[PDB]
C-alpha cells in the first residue's frame, strides 16, 4: 500500500538506490479522509499501530469554535469553506482540512454576547449591576460587528478532521482577520 | 547451533622447516634412541613446548623490571618450572629459563624417571611397564609415558597395587603355566 519509506527516493547526490528489502508494515500510509460539509455526519473508526484508535471524518456539519478575545467556546455549524492556502480546488470541493478558512453560524456567540454584556449585535437588580460592571470594558472589533451583522463568522480550523474526526477552530481576529478578509475581498 | 562446536583444540608440534638436514636428523635420532621415543613427533612436541616457554620468558625479559605484568608472569613461570623440576631454587631468575634444553624436559618424563629410579632395566622396559599399567604415581595408575612428573610426586612412584610386580594376582601367562603344571 501507500508507503512512507525513503527507499524509492533518490540519493542527495542524485544517484539511484537499489532495493534491498520489501515494504514494511511499520512505514505504511493510508488514504486521505477528504472530509466535506454535509448534514449526513459520518465518522469512521480506524485501528492503528499499538491498538490505538483514529477517527476519519468523511462528512461533518458542526464544529467546536472559540472566540479568543472573549474566551468563549461554542458548538456551531460550519456554513462553507471560503479560503484554502494549500489548494484552491479544496475550496470548490468544500474540503475540511486543518487551517482552512470557513464560515460558521454566529447564533451561539450572539446569544452569549446578549446574555453576558446585555447587548444585541425581568432582569434582577444584581443582574443589571453585573451587566453594568461588565459594560465598562466592553470593547468590540468593528469588523467582527459587521460579520455578526450577516450572521456568519470567519473561522480557521485548528484541528485535523482526518485524524481526530472533528472540525474545531477559532474565530479570526485582529491582524489575521484583516489579512484573510483582504485575501477574500478579491 | 551445536554446543560441541564451541569446544576448542590446538596443535602441539610443527614439522621441521628443512626436512633433510643431516646434522639435525642425527641429533634427533640420538635423542630419540637415548630416551626411547616412538617417533620424531614426541621430540617435536617437546621442542614446541620448550620454544613456547622460552618465547614467553624472552617476552617477559623485554619488559621493564618494575613492570607489574613482568613481575606477575615471571613469578608464575618460575613457579611452574620449580614445580615441574626444570629449575632449582638457586635458579630463581627468568634468565635461567632461556638456558633450558629439550633434555631437561625429557628427563621429567615418567618413562625416564621409571628407568632412572631402577624399576626398569632399560628405557624401553620402562615404557612397556607404564603402557602395561605396572606403574602408579601416587594412588593413581598412569599409563602415559609422556606424563610429566612433578618434584613432589617424584618420590611417590611405585608399582601398581593390582599388578604382579606391586601386589598379588600374577599374570595370565603365569596362571596358565601353573594350571598346566598342576597336572
Amino acid at each position: 500500500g501507500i508507503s512512507r519509506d525513503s527507499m524509492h527516493k533518490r540519493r542527495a547526490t542524485g544517484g539511484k538506490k537499489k532495493a534491498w528489502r520489501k515494504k514494511r508494515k511499520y512505514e505504511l500510509g493510508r488514504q486521505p479522509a477528504n472530509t466535506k460539509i454535509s448534514a449526513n455526519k459520518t465518522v469512521r473508526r480506524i485501528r492503528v499501530r499499538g491498538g490505538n484508535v483514529k477517527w476519519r471524518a468523511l462528512r461533518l456539519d458542526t464544529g467546536n469554535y472559540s472566540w479568543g478575545s472573549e474566551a468563549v467556546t461554542r458548538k456551531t455549524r460550519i456554513l462553507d469553506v471560503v479560503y484554502n492556502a494549500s489548494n484552491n480546488e479544496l475550496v470548490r470541493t468544500q474540503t475540511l482540512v486543518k487551517s482552512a478558512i470557513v464560515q460558521v453560524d454566529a447564533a451561539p456567540f450572539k446569544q452569549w454576547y446578549l446574555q453576558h454584556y446585555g447587548v444585541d449585535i425581568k432582569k434582577s437588580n444584581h443582574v443589571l449591576r453585573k451587566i453594568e460592571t461588565r459594560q465598562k470594558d466592553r470593547k468590540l472589533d468593528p469588523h467582527i460587528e459587521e460579520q455578526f451583522g450577516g450572521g456568519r463568522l470567519l473561522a480557521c480550523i485548528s484541528s485535523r478532521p482526518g485524524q481526530c474526526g472533528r472540525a474545531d477552530g477559532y474565530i479570526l481576529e485582529g491582524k489575521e482577520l484583516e489579512f484573510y478578509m483582504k485575501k477574500l475581498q478579491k | 547451533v551445536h554446543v560441541a562446536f564451541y569446544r576448542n583444540y590446538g596443535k602441539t608440534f610443527k614439522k621441521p622447516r628443512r626436512p633433510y638436514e643431516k646434522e639435525r636428523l642425527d641429533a634427533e635420532l640420538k635423542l630419540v634412541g637415548e630416551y626411547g621415543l616412538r617417533c620424531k613427533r614426541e621430540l617435536w612436541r617437546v621442542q614446541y613446548a620448550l620454544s613456547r616457554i622460552r618465547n614467553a620468558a624472552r617476552m617477559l625479559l623485554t619488559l621493564d623490571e618494575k613492570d607489574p605484568r613482568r613481575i606477575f608472569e615471571g613469578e608464575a613461570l618460575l613457579r611452574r618450572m620449580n614445580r615441574y623440576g626444570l629449575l632449582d631454587e638457586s635458579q630463581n631468575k627468568l634468565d635461567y629459563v632461556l638456558s633450558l634444553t629439550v633434555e631437561n624436559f625429557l628427563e621429567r618424563r615418567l618413562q625416564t624417571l621409571v628407568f632412572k629410579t631402577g624399576m626398569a632395566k632399560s628405557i624401553h622396559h620402562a615404557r612397556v611397564l607404564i603402557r602395561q599399567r605396572h606403574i602408579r604415581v601416587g594412588r593413581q595408575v598412569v599409563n602415559v609415558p609422556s606424563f610429566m612428573v612433578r618434584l613432589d610426586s617424584q618420590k611417590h612412584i611405585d608399582f601398581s597395587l593390582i599388578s604382579p610386580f606391586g601386589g598379588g594376582r600374577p599374570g595370565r601367562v603365569k596362571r596358565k603355566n601353573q594350571k598346566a603344571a598342576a597336572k
Binding site: - | 547451533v1 554446543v3 564451541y6 569446544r7 607489574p68 606477575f72 608464575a76
Partner: protein, 259 residues
C-alpha cells in the same frame, strides 16, 4: 526480527553470571521486572548455580512454586525474575536472608544479612516530577514509584525504603564526601568516597572516588550509588569492603594461605 526475542544464547548471556561455555545452547533470559536484563541475577541462577539448592531447571521451578522464596518481602514464583542491586532475597524455611551486592570483581554476591538488616533496602532516585492532579512523585532505578516524596529529595539521591510498610524512612543527598559504590563499568563493585564532580553541559557527569587505601578512580554519574552519609555505609558490605586488590598482592595472599 518481527517482534520481541524470547531466547537468550549462553554465549550472549552476561559474563558476570559465570555460565559454562559447554553447559548448553541457552541461558535463562531475564523476565521483565524492576532491573534491567544485563544488570540482574535471575532467581534460577541464585537457587541453582549459587546456592545449589536446586540441581536442575525442574528442581528450581519446583522449589519456587512452593512459595518459599521472597524478594523484597514479596513471594515471587517466576524463575527468571530479575533480582538486581540492593535487592533482598529471603528464604524463611532456611532462615536465610541475602542482599545482592557487587563484589570487588564486579559480580553479584549474596551477602548474608541479619533479620534487622533484611527489613529495608536502598534505592537511587531517577527524577522527581508531578503526576496527574499535580501530585509529586519520584521513581527509583528499580522500577519503584513513590508519591508525596520529601521535597528535599531530588534526582541521583539515595532513599532508605522500609519494605514492610513500603515507605521512605531516610535519604542521602548526592554530594562530595559520601561513601558510594560503583554499579557499572570496569570499576563496578568498588567502594570509596566522592572527591569531586565534573559537570559538562549536554554530556555525562564525571565523578571521582578515592578508595579507603587512597586509590583513585573516575566513573560516570549513572554508575555511582550512594551507600551512606559521610564515610560509614548504611548497610553491611561484602567481604573485602569494596577494596580492589592487584593481581600481584592477590597472588601473594594466595601463596601465603597455601603455605
Amino acid at each position: 526480527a518481527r517482534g520481541l526475542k524470547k531466547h537468550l544464547k549462553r554465549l550472549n548471556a552476561p559474563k558476570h553470571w559465570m555460565l559454562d561455555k559447554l553447559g548448553g545452547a541457552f541461558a535463562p533470559k531475564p523476565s521483565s521486572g524492576p532491573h534491567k536484563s544485563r544488570e540482574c541475577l535471575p532467581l534460577i541462577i541464585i537457587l541453582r548455580n549459587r546456592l545449589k539448592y536446586a540441581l536442575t531447571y525442574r528442581e528450581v521451578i519446583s522449589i519456587l512454586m512452593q512459595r518459599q522464596v521472597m524478594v523484597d518481602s514479596k513471594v515471587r514464583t517466576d524463575k527468571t525474575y530479575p533480582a538486581g542491586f540492593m535487592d533482598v532475597v529471603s528464604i524463611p524455611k532456611t532462615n536465610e536472608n541475602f542482599r545482592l551486592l557487587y563484589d570487588t570483581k564486579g559480580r553479584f554476591r549474596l551477602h548474608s544479612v541479619r533479620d534487622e538488616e533484611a527489613k529495608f533496602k536502598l534505592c537511587k532516585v531517577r527524577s522527581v516530577q508531578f503526576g496527574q492532579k499535580g501530585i509529586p512523585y519520584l521513581n527509583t532505578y528499580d522500577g519503584r514509584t513513590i508519591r508525596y516524596p520529601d521535597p528535599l529529595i531530588k534526582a541521583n539521591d539515595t532513599i532508605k525504603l522500609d519494605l514492610e510498610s513500603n515507605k521512605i524512612v531516610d535519604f542521602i543527598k548526592f554530594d562530595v564526601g559520601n561513601v558510594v559504590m560503583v554499579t557499572g563499568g570496569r570499576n563496578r563493585g568498588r567502594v570509596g568516597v566522592i572527591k569531586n564532580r565534573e559537570k559538562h553541559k549536554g554530556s555525562f557527569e564525571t565523578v571521582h572516588i578515592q578508595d579507603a587505601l587512597g586509590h583513585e578512580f573516575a566513573t560516570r554519574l549513572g554508575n555511582v550509588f550512594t551507600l551512606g552519609k559521610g564515610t560509614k555505609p548504611w548497610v553491611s558490605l561484602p567481604k573485602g569492603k569494596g577494596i580492589k586488590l592487584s593481581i600481584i598482592e592477590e597472588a601473594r595472599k594466595r601463596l601465603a594461605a597455601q603455605s
